[PDB]
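Long-time lurker, first post. I've been practising inverse folding by hand and with some scripts of my own, and I keep getting stuck on stretches where the structure tokens seem ambiguous. Below is the full token string for one chain I'm working on. Before anyone asks, I'm not after the true native sequence, just a reasonable design that respects the backbone. If someone could post their per-position residues I'd love to compare against what I wrote down in my notebook.
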């Protein structure tokens, strides 16, 4: 059950917000900063530490956090609690010991991620988004490979932290505008449809092994240019038909017009027929112990 924590408890768990406990990607001075910790009950946790002045009203911070804390699903790294003592604003979530999609996808050492695993990530994250939407949290902020985490069983999960903005005014987003939906600059707001656009960018990341701005992915996607768009590391692992189908899905998600993008249920239905090696454990497919 979602609960409150004291700041002393969280400082103890994180060894005083020690810099080497940072597990997020932007270092100590960023709008998004996350620390690993360990509670006295031996539970490992992830602690997002919001910047000063980001959520100045404790009541509105607590109410958002509580709302997110109602969500409980096995495709999410779930929200366990919050802290709002002494001007701090913290979210406490389940710790994900097998690190991020970005690590495995962009910074692989032994070999590139398998096709079947990339498809499993895409499906499970779509399912997570469908779940969030069903529980009234249809907005997700800065969806990218750093928000996809792998649990103890190496299963991919969506970080709960993105269900809240980095700041109450929404101006502390991390996403470079090259990757934001076209309507976001105009409106300054995330909508359910803009989340789908961001899912498109995740699909492009998975297909390519690269972080390619959608505008650049444009002619490549038009030409279904497998050589240019697809990760060379995948060669041999997928049929041209299946690769093309995932490209087409990404195209749908990246449509300029928000109303033309698929809804979360359509993402799931499009992803299911493409799944491979369903009977193989994520530990094995991902190549982690």
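-- Answer (accepted) --
I ran through it position by position. Result:
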């Amino acid at each position: 059950q979602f609960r409150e924590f004291s700041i002393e408890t969280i400082r103890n768990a994180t060894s005083g917000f020690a810099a080497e406990n940072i597990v997020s990607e932007h270092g100590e001075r960023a709008p998004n900063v996350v620390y690993k910790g360990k509670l006295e009950n031996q539970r490992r946790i992830a602690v997002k530490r919001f910047n000063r002045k980001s959520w100045p009203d404790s009541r509105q911070f607590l109410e958002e956090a509580k709302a997110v804390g109602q969500l409980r699903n096995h495709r999410m790294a779930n929200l366990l609690g919050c802290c709002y003592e002494d001007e701090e604003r913290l979210l406490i979530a389940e710790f994900m010991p097998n690190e991020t999609l970005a690590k495995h996808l962009f910074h692989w050492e032994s070999q590139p991620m398998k096709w079947a695993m990339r498809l499993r990530v895409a499906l499970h994250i779509a399912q997570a988004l469908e779940y969030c939407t069903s529980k009234g949290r249809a907005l997700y902020h800065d969806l990218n490979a750093y928000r996809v985490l792998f649990d103890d069983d190496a299963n991919p999960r969506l970080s709960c932290f993105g269900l809240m903005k980095n700041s109450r005014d929404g101006k502390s987003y991390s996403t470079n505008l090259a990757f934001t939906p076209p309507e976001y600059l105009r409106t300054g707001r995330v909508t359910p449809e803009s989340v789908i656009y961001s899912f498109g960018t995740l699909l492009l990341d998975l297909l390519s092994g690269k972080h390619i701005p959608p505008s650049h992915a444009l002619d490549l996607i038009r030409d279904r240019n497998i050589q240019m768009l697809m990760d060379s590391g995948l060669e041999g692992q997928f049929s041209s038909d299946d690769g093309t189908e995932l490209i087409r899905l990404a195209s749908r998600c990246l449509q300029y017009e928000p109303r033309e993008r698929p809804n979360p249920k359509s993402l799931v239905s499009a992803m299911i027929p493409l799944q491979k090696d369903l009977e193989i454990a994520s530990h094995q497919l991902l190549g982690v112990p």
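A couple of notes from the structure itself: The chain has eleven helices and eight strands. Residues 82 and 91 are 4 Å apart (CA to CA). Happy to go over any region you disagree with.
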